[PDB]
Amino acid sequence: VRLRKNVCYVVLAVFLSEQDEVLLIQEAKRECRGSWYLPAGRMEPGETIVEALQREVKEEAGLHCEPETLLSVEERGPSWVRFVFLARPTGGILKTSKEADAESLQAAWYPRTSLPTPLRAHDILHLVELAAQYRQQARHPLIL
């Protein structure tokens, strides 16, 4: 729970439902306004990694969640790190266009196979595939 001063630590949530839908958010940030991404943001000092994840999901999408696995850990140089969790919903209220504000314009569930446009960046396509693969394996355990 101690963070280095000149390091940026990011958490990102991939939700992939039993109906093969992904939870996306429509960015209110001026630097990518109206583009679509996954719930994500920067860890704050004093929070655990999973507390950060839950806060960002709640702020951006309105939902309560729990992590199911860590799907990917990425660095971009030594001063940027991202923890990409698979998460699942455990309560809260989906934050729709009714609540449009500076945290997010809306949150919405889209078919993994028919994602909205424009996407903020195309790295989440791979992160979503990781989730699809984990879900596939979980439903096909292959016990003889």
Q: Report which of 47, 25, 45, 20 is spatially closest to residue 35, judged by C-alpha positions.
A: 25
Feature table: binding site? 23
Feature table: binding site for Mg(2+)? 23
Q: Kindly list the domain boundaries of the chain, sorted by start residue.
A: 1-144
- What's the token pair of residue 70? 């860590």
DSSP E strand boundaries for 53-111:
63-75, 80-92, 106-111
CA atoms within 13 A on the CB side of 117: 2
Task: Write down the residue that tokens 């934050």 correspond to.
Answer: 95
What is the CATH architecture assignment of 1-144?
Alpha-Beta Complex (3.90)
Do 104 and 26 meet the contact criterion of CB atoms below 8 Å apart? yes
**Resolution given for this structure, in angstroms:** 2.1
